[PDB]
Design an enzyme around this catalytic site. Structure first.
Site, mmCIF file in Angstrom:
data_model
loop_
_atom_site.group_PDB
_atom_site.id
_atom_site.type_symbol
_atom_site.label_atom_id
_atom_site.label_comp_id
_atom_site.label_asym_id
_atom_site.label_seq_id
_atom_site.Cartn_x
_atom_site.Cartn_y
_atom_site.Cartn_z
ATOM 1 N N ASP C 43 -6.877 -3.839 -9.651
ATOM 2 C CA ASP C 43 -6.832 -3.736 -8.203
ATOM 3 C C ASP C 43 -6.683 -2.276 -7.780
ATOM 4 O OD1 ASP C 43 -6.692 -4.248 -5.513
ATOM 5 O OD2 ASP C 43 -5.059 -5.707 -5.651
HETATM 6 C C1 LIG Z 1 12.070 2.269 0.941
HETATM 7 C C2 LIG Z 1 10.976 2.170 2.010
HETATM 8 C C3 LIG Z 1 11.040 0.906 2.894
HETATM 9 C C4 LIG Z 1 9.946 -0.164 2.609
HETATM 10 C C5 LIG Z 1 9.250 -0.773 3.868
HETATM 11 C C6 LIG Z 1 7.692 -0.858 3.824
HETATM 12 C C7 LIG Z 1 7.067 -2.212 4.303
HETATM 13 C C8 LIG Z 1 5.692 -2.614 3.672
HETATM 14 C C9 LIG Z 1 5.309 -4.131 3.711
HETATM 15 C C10 LIG Z 1 3.925 -4.445 4.359
HETATM 16 C C11 LIG Z 1 2.949 -5.318 3.523
HETATM 17 C C12 LIG Z 1 1.454 -5.076 3.791
HETATM 18 O O1 LIG Z 1 0.695 -4.769 2.907
HETATM 19 S S1 LIG Z 1 0.818 -5.267 5.520
HETATM 20 C C13 LIG Z 1 -0.759 -6.292 5.605
HETATM 21 C C14 LIG Z 1 -1.936 -5.550 6.291
HETATM 22 N N1 LIG Z 1 -3.269 -6.156 6.104
HETATM 23 C C15 LIG Z 1 -3.936 -6.302 4.879
HETATM 24 O O2 LIG Z 1 -3.388 -5.900 3.853
HETATM 25 C C16 LIG Z 1 -5.319 -6.955 4.850
HETATM 26 C C17 LIG Z 1 -6.221 -6.588 3.641
HETATM 27 N N2 LIG Z 1 -5.513 -5.784 2.634
HETATM 28 C C18 LIG Z 1 -6.092 -4.660 2.009
HETATM 29 O O3 LIG Z 1 -7.238 -4.381 2.351
HETATM 30 C C19 LIG Z 1 -5.309 -3.827 0.947
HETATM 31 O O4 LIG Z 1 -6.002 -2.625 0.915
HETATM 32 C C20 LIG Z 1 -5.307 -4.438 -0.491
HETATM 33 C C21 LIG Z 1 -6.249 -5.634 -0.580
HETATM 34 C C22 LIG Z 1 -3.879 -4.862 -0.788
HETATM 35 C C23 LIG Z 1 -5.778 -3.364 -1.602
HETATM 36 O O5 LIG Z 1 -7.103 -3.288 -1.634
HETATM 37 P P1 LIG Z 1 -8.013 -2.358 -2.948
HETATM 38 O O6 LIG Z 1 -8.729 -3.503 -3.616
HETATM 39 O O7 LIG Z 1 -8.859 -1.423 -2.114
HETATM 40 O O8 LIG Z 1 -6.887 -1.715 -3.728
#
Ligand SMILES: CCCCCCCCCCCC(=O)SCCNC(=O)CCNC(=O)[C@H](O)C(C)(C)COP(=O)(O)O
Ligand SMILES: CCCCCCCCCCCCCCCCCC(=O)OC[C@H](COP(=O)([O-])OCC(O)COP(=O)([O-])OC[C@@H](COC(=O)CCCCCCCCCCCCCCCCC)OC(=O)CCCCCCCCCCCCCCCCC)OC(=O)CCCCCCCCCCCCCCCCC
Ligand SMILES: CCCCCCCCCCCCCCCCCC(=O)OC[C@H](COP(=O)([O-])OCC(O)COP(=O)([O-])OC[C@@H](COC(=O)CCCCCCCCCCCCCCCCC)OC(=O)CCCCCCCCCCCCCCCCC)OC(=O)CCCCCCCCCCCCCCCCC
Ligand SMILES: CCCCCCCCCCCCCCCCC[C@@H](O)O[C@H](CO[C@H](O)CCCCCCCCCCCCCCC)COP(=O)(O)OCC[N+](C)(C)C
Ligand SMILES: CCCCCCCCCCCCCCCCC[C@@H](O)O[C@H](CO[C@H](O)CCCCCCCCCCCCCCC)COP(=O)(O)OCC[N+](C)(C)C
Ligand SMILES: CCCCCCCC/C=C\CCCCCCCC(=O)O[C@H](COC(=O)CCCCCCC/C=C/CCCCCCCC)COP(=O)(O)OCCN
Lengths: 70, 107, 88, 178, 459, 56
Positions: C43
């Site tokens: 990934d």
């Molecule tokens: C210590 C600090 C504090 C912590 C707080 C931080 C909070 C973070 C939590 C939020 C979770 C989320 O991801 S928020 C959700 C937002 N929406 C999406 O993720 C839709 C599609 N996802 C993608 O496209 C990504 O890139 C992916 C497929 C994963 C990679 O793709 P690759 O195939 O290109 O690697």
């Protein structure tokens, strides 16, 4: 290890040349002055204070102590 | 608009000339190496060797026309005289009051 | 300093070492030129963790814009050598 | 740094950037390695739950509360690599970087030392002098009309050609010249 | 006194009969020799003065100024040798003639037993400086700068002539000795108030006093290097010397008359020091620093105490030397970059280390680092002002802190950081420039060994 | 070579000539202010057996 690399740096020739010239001229005139001052101090100077003899008037340069000042 | 877009016949702005390119060891005084070298020599000599050294030595050994040690000796003899005779050192009045004629108020 | 002058061979060996310590990717399958998404089925999050592992291994950190387009171990080694000015 | 920037960042790049920042700050909070591994795996598990979500609106609503949560708990003193833009040795060696053109002003007594180096430098100068005249026309013919749309440069396509605008990228002083 | 004046006059035929390629060497050598002759004048007495004749006298207030004036000409020639390379021989000779005439006028001004002669020479200095500024100037604002410099001075000094002729008609003499011995108090009257103003404003405008300092940045920025050197070193001290000479007849009117000017100077040093913090031009920054220093000198002269006078003399000499050195350094940068902007050429310590050392020493001397004579004058004036009023210490400390701030700001912006990449015409510093800086800086550190030579007649 | 370097180096003598002339003129002007020589009440002195003027 034969890993000696080249150090890129500005030309230090002109700065060093100016410093050498300035030191050369300053010493050129200061060394004779220092030698003359030392010879005068060891051999001649440091007069001692006296009372003016009666009937005698001194000249203007006889009121000073160091021979170069006189 | 057949105008030449030129305001006047002007020489192009010349490019600055490097003194080192045509003459290394240039000393930055003149473009002619001999006049340059002699200018450097006279400047260095007559400033550093002559003025900065001989004049400094002359100023260092200037005779005391400001009369500092003379004042020291005068003060020493006056304090010797006054301590011995019981006089109270320096006096508050700079001039003797006998010689000042104050004006009578009669108010 | 007293830092040995690391070479291209050392960089490649260290990159492959850290990659073989990554359990997600089989050691036999990977090759210097082995791609990440297609040849090994990883990934993008796996790619960013690989970049972070490289960063922790070599003690310097790669900007995100450069890291997001580092997709093979060979070009990772090339990037590191270009950054640290490695001769051979 | 080396790569040319794009006009904007897509959603996927922003999500990756938040993931990297959150992992770095979690490592800063969790000093020990086993604790960091545990909490980083938990972070990845919480992070990839919404991987398969499809619509754009909910995806954009996410990553935003995520950024706010990151900012609330961002460890106001994170770990920084020494050479990083915030590290303790970010620009320590920048005073030792001297340009290459400074060698053109060396006294002939100085250039007497290192003769082979200056012969190689003259060869490089000749190569640059020819390559620049080739590169000007190559870039003139390759550029789109109306000006470039991005600050990305094309490679060399002929045999004797060199990449355009290469002199000041190849001749960097060094990382640690002294 | 003629043993100095006559060789300075003979400098002109020597210059005009010199070979086309030997003007600079001869002028420099003979100017240095003239300076050596001037050194004899320093010996001074604790008594009245060195009254050579009915026309000229010397004093321990005039002697350091005369020595500095005679010493400045070789440095100005050295600085001007560079940018006048492509000039015809006749015009170079005319430039040297202007410099020699300015030196002669200053020399005769500083001796000047009689006040109308002082006024005549104090105004005669205005013409060569104006010609130098408006003829050999690089920019197009040199004409406006020269107009400002001329008209501020003339508007200030025209009432002074009327005041002087009135004073001679009433008292009967303008010889400084008779004026000092026959001084009489000034009654608090409107006519006396306006006479005080007419006597004071001419010297105030040339200090420059805050609010009347507008001409100085223009004149200093638009002048060639030699003009900037002389304006910053000697021409500013004419007002201070005139005030010191003329405040003998303004008593006891000065006790309350001084307040408007004291407030203006005390607030204006802070104002100009703060202005120096936000400046994009080296020359403008140096000019405003000069304004701050001269405002503090104005405060010293207005307080009118022995410590005030000693500090003012020392600060005048030290400021002249330091400002000349700073202007020379700025000109060395400008002749390489042709921009005169602080932020363009950066990190020059990597390329020019010895010139960076010169920059550091000049900034430290401007910062008034002990035991330099700059701090000697600064501290004497601060103590005198504290005795005048304990509340002045706040303003003096603020001025000191801001002064250190902008001095080190100017040093760091130009010498430290990363070099500008696209600038590749920065050649190694020549021996001429290094010798110029050395001859500027060494006299300061030699004078700090004998501070009594520059502490004035009240030492 | 004399009579050739003079035509180029004659100018050097001028500043020095001016200095000696100025010294002479200073002494000459000094000669006109002798109205109180050996008449000041502080330095009122009896002349030496071979002295005509206390100072010149
Ligand atoms: C210590 C600090 C504090 C912590 C707080 C931080 C909070 C973070 C939590 C939020 C979770 C989320 O991801 S928020 C959700 C937002 N929406 C999406 O993720 C839709 C599609 N996802 C993608 O496209 C990504 O890139 C992916 C497929 C994963 C990679 O793709 P690759 O195939 O290109 O690697
Ligand atoms: C940048 C640079 C720019 C430079 C510009 C040019 C310079 C301008 C200024 C020049 C001014 C010169 C000047 O005014 O001179 C001042 C002054 C002149 O002296 P003076 O006041 O006229 O004479 C005083 C008396 O009237 C007479 O005293 P006396 O007769 O008792 O003294 C004896 C005599 C001689 O004394 C002796 O011979 C003996 C003294 C030491 C004896 C010690 C014992 C030795 C014997 C034992 C060992 C051998 C024998 C035994 C062997 C067997 C052993 C087992 O003294 C001297 O000769 C002193 C010589 C000083 C020379 C100064 C020359 C100045 C030149 C100016 C230009 C210089 C350019 C740079 C180059 C200069 C040259 C390097 O000289 C000094 O001040 C000397 C200073 C000594 C300092 C001592 C240490 C002090 C430290 C305190 C602080 C410590 C904590 C910090
Ligand atoms: C402390 C006593 C020292 C005794 C030793 C005698 C030293 C003679 C120095 C004569 C004056 C210096 C001339 C200024 C231009 C320097 C020429 C140059 O380019 O050097 C190239 C030369 C060759 O190096 P390079 O590799 O070819 O050049 C590469 C770059 O230039 C890179 O070069 P760089 O990175 O090495 O930097 C150049 C260096 C040199 O540039 C400077 O900045 C030196 C000038 C600092 C003064 C700044 C003005 C502040 C007011 C001080 C006025 C007092 C002067 C006293 C009389 C002086 C007589 C002329 O700058 C510094 O090192 C930093 C200076 C900051 C020091 C702050 C402390 C000052 C107040 C201390 C109190 C002094 C009196 C003590 C009273 C109580 C005890 C009795 O290097 C040197 O020789 C350095 C000069 C020696 C350091 C002087 C530091 C203190 C001395 C101050 C004056 C003497 C005090 C008398 C008391 C004696 C007891
Ligand atoms: C570079 C690396 C280091 C190499 C150098 C190592 C050696 C270090 C020495 C350098 C400084 C160390 C301090 C040592 C000081 C000793 C000298 C000092 O004692 O002499 C001073 C004397 O110095 C002079 O008085 C001051 C110098 C003169 C300054 C005039 C400037 C020259 C003219 C140039 C043009 C003027 C421009 C400015 C206009 C005013 C003070 O002496 P003073 O106690 O008092 O009485 C003298 C002796 N008496 C009693 C017989 C009379
Ligand atoms: C612009 C940048 C700065 C330039 C330089 C500015 C410095 C010039 C300021 C002049 C200093 C003050 C002038 C006069 C001071 C005397 C004190 C007097 O003003 O105060 C009261 C005077 O009262 C009133 O002020 C009367 C004068 C009112 C008219 C003056 C105009 C006020 C503002 C004008 C300012 C304009 C300055 C710029 C001109 C272009 C005292 O009352 P009184 O006891 O009765 O008078 C005492 C004097 N006696 C004994 C001779 C009679
Ligand atoms: C940078 C520009 C500054 C310009 C100078 C500003 C101040 C100018 C000084 C005032 C001007 C007149 C000077 C007075 C000349 C001296 C003569 C004198 O003092 O005698 C007075 C003369 O006093 C006067 O006549 C003054 C009249 C003023 C008329 C001119 C006004 C000019 C402007 C005045 C206001 C501005 C002054 C301060 C300016 C502040 C800075 C801008 C007494 O005269 P008598 O009649 O003989 O004796 C009285 C007993 N019977």
């Amino acid at each position: 290890h034969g890993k000696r690399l080249f150090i890129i740096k500005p030309s230090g020739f002109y700065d060093r040349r100016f410093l050498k010239l300035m030191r050369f001229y300053i010493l050129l005139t200061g060394i004779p002055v220092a030698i003359g001052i030392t010879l005068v101090n060891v051999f001649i100077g440091e007069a001692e204070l006296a009372d003016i003899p009666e009937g005698y008037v001194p000249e203007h340069w006889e009121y000073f102590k160091h021979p170069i000042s006189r | 608009p057949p105008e030449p877009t030129i305001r006047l016949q002007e020489d192009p702005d010349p490019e600055d000339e490097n003194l080192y390119e045509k003459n290394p060891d240039s000393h930055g005084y003149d473009k002619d190496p001999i006049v340059d070298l002699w200018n450097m020599r006279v400047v260095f000599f007559f400033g550093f060797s002559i003025v900065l050294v001989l004049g400094s030595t002359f100023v260092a050994y200037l005779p005391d026309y400001r009369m500092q040690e003379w004042a020291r000796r005068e003060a020493e003899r006056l304090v010797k005289y006054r301590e011995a005779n019981g006089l109270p050192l320096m006096e508050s009045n700079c001039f003797d009051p006998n010689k000042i004629q104050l004006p009578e108020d009669e108010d | 300093s007293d830092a040995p002058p690391l070479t291209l061979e050392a960089i490649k060996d260290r990159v492959l070492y850290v990659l073989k310590l990554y359990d997600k990717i089989d050691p036999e399958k990977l090759s210097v030129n082995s791609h990440f998404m297609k040849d090994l089925g990883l990934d993008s999050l796996d790619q960013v963790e690989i970049i972070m592992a490289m960063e922790d291994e070599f003690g310097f950190e790669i900007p995100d814009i450069d890291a997001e387009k580092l997709m093979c171990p060979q070009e990772i080694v090339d990037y590191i050598a270009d950054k640290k000015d490695v001769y051979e | 740094a080396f790569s040319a920037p794009a006009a904007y960042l897509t959603h996927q790049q922003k999500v990756l950037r938040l993931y990297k920042r959150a992992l770095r700050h979690l490592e800063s909070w969790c000093v020990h390695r086993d604790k960091y591994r545990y909490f980083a795996c938990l972070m990845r598990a919480r992070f990839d739950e919404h991987k398969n979500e499809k619509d754009m609106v909910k995806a954009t609503q996410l990553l935003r509360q995520a950024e706010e949560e990151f900012w609330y708990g961002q460890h106001p003193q994170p770990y920084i690599f020494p050479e990083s833009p915030g590290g303790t040795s970010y620009e320590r060696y920048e005073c030792y970087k001297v340009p290459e053109w400074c060698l053109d002003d060396w006294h002939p007594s100085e250039k007497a030392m290192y003769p082979d180096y200056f012969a190689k430098r003259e060869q490089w100068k000749r190569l640059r002098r020819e390559s620049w005249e080739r590169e000007v026309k190559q870039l003139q013919e390759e550029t789109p009309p109306g000006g470039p749309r991005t600050e990305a440069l094309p490679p060399a396509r002929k045999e004797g050609d060199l990449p355009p605008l290469w002199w000041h990228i190849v001749t960097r002083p060094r990382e640690r010249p002294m | 006194m003629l043993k100095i004046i006559i060789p300075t006059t003979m400098l002109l035929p020597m210059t005009w009969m010199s070979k086309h390629n030997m003007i600079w060497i001869n002028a420099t050598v003979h100017s240095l020799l003239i300076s050596l002759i001037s050194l004899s004048l320093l010996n001074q007495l604790g008594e009245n003065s060195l009254n050579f004749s009915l026309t000229f006298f010397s004093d321990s207030l005039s002697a350091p100024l005369l020595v500095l004036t005679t010493w400045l000409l070789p440095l100005m020639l050295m600085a001007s040798q560079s940018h006048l390379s492509k000039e015809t021989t006749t015009r170079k000779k005319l430039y040297i003639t202007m410099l020699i005439l300015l030196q002669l006028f200053l020399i005769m001004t500083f001796t000047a037993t009689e006040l109308i002669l002082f006024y005549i020479l104090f105004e005669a200095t205005l013409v060569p400086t104006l010609i130098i500024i408006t003829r050999w100037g690089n920019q197009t604002e040199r004409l406006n700068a020269g107009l400002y410099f001329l008209f501020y001075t003339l508007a200030g000094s025209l009432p002074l002539l009327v005041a002087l002729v009135y004073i001679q008609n009433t008292t009967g003499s303008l010889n400084f000795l008779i004026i000092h011995y026959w001084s009489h108090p000034l009654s608090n009257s409107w006519s006396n108030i306006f006479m005080w103003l007419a006597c004071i404003m001419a010297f105030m405008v040339k200090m420059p006093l805050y609010g009347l300092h507008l001409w100085l940045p223009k004149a200093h920025v638009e002048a060639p290097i030699a003009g900037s050197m002389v304006l910053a070193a000697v021409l500013l001290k004419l007002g201070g010397y005139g005030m010191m000479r003329i405040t003998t007849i303004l008593n006891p009117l000065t006790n309350y008359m001084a307040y408007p000017f004291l407030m203006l100077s005390m607030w204006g040093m802070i104002m100009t020091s703060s202005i120096c913090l936000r400046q994009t031009d080296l020359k403008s920054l140096i000019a405003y620093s000069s304004v701050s220093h001269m405002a503090l000198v104005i405060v010293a002269i207005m307080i009118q105490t022995p410590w005030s006078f000693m500090g003012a003399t020392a600060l005048m000499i030290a400021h002249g030397l330091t400002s000349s050195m700073l202007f020379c350094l700025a000109n060395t940068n400008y002749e390489r970059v042709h921009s005169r902007t602080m932020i363009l050429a950066r990190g020059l310590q990597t390329l020019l280390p010895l010139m960076a050392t010169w920059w550091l020493v000049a900034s430290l001397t401007n910062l008034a680092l002990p035991p330099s004579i700059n701090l000697i004058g600064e501290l004497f004036i601060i103590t005198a002002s504290f005795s005048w009023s304990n509340i002045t210490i706040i303003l003096m400390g603020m001025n000191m802190m801001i002064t250190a701030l902008y001095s080190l700001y100017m040093l760091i912006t130009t010498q430290r950081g990363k070099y500008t990449h696209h600038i590749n015409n920065i050649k190694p510093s020549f021996t001429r420039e290094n010798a110029l800086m050395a001859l500027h800086i060494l006299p300061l550190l030699l004078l700090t060994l004998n501070p009594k030579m520059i502490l004035g007649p009240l030492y | 070579n004399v009579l050739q370097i003079v035509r180029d180096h004659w100018v050097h003598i001028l500043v020095p000539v001016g200095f000696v002339f100025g010294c002479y003129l200073d002494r000459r002007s000094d000669e006109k202010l002798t109205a109180f020589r050996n008449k000041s009440l502080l330095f009122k002195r009896e002349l030496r057996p071979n002295e005509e003027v206390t100072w010149k």
